[PDB]
Structure 1
Amino acid sequence: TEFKAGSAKKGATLFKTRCLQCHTVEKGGPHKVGPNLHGIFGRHSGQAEGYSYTDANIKKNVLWDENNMSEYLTNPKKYIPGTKMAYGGLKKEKDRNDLITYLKKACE
């Protein structure tokens, strides 16, 4: 597609350090500061059952797929205005390619 596909292994250590403190990946996993990311791709925004989101993450209504996530992870607070995801963004496109290739095989 537009986005390519980095190494799934470089993408693991990216999450372990930059995202695991607020989000969880496995099936039925517990919601922390952020949602349980399982089954995130193909799913509309603001729809992880049992999480009380902002009406910004809900009314945005996008279908999560590899390309729009790259446009979100670059600068999150610009893509979804008013979100409570306290995070600046990943500026290097290679590190954004590594992380998404890990997440699409993890949240299957």
Structure 2
Amino acid sequence: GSAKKGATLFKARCLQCHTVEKGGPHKVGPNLHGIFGRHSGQAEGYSYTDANIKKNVLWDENNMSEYLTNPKKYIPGTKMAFGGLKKEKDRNDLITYLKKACE
């Protein structure tokens, strides 16, 4: 999708816990800078739960779309609570802005 609509979707639903700046501070969640290619539970400087380190799954543009729809159904026992994107235009615009901001 578009990168202009994905910039207002991340600064509204996320951002309060994650950050796209290189070397940012950890507020309530870990940093998403460099998330495409790393395993789940690899960010340093943050304590993860026992259900996020045991899954260990590579974050690609096909498996990350299922985690956005339901974060508690894909990974049972997660700590970050989030309703979940139920539209296909909101998941394609948020993944295009997370690939250009987190390089």
If the TM-score is normalised by the length of the shorter chain, which range does it land in?
over 0.9
In 2, Cα distance between the equivalents of 1:88 and 1:79? 13
In the other structure, the counterpart of 2:64 is: 69
With normalisation by structure 1, the TM-score equals 0.93
Tell me how far 1:21 sits from its aligned partner. 1.1
Q: 1:39 touches 1:107 (CA, 8 Å); kept in 2?
A: yes
Gaps of 5+ in 2: none
SS in 1 for 2:4: coil
SS in 1 for 2:25: coil
Tell me how far 1:88 sits from its aligned partner. 1.4
Tell me how far 1:22 sits from its aligned partner. 1.1
SS in 1 for 2:99: helix
Tell me how far 1:80 sits from its aligned partner. 1.0
Deviant stretches of 4+, over 2 Å:
none
Q: 1:14 touches 1:99 (CA, 8 Å); kept in 2?
A: yes
CA shift digits 1:4-27 (9 cap, x unpaired): xx1011001001000011111111
Tell me how far 1:89 sits from its aligned partner. 0.5
User: How many percent identity over aligned positions?
Assistant: 98
Tell me how far 1:32 sits from its aligned partner. 1.2
Aligned length: 103
In 2, Cα distance between the equivalents of 1:43 and 1:49? 12
Name the structure where helix makes up a greater proportion of residues: 2
Q: 1:77 touches 1:88 (CA, 8 Å); kept in 2?
A: no
With normalisation by structure 2, the TM-score equals 0.97
In 1, Cα distance between the equivalents of 2:88 and 2:78? 22
Tell me how far 1:50 sits from its aligned partner. 1.1
In the other structure, the counterpart of 2:42 is: 47
Gaps of 5+ in 1: 1-5
In 1, Cα distance between the equivalents of 2:101 and 2:38? 15
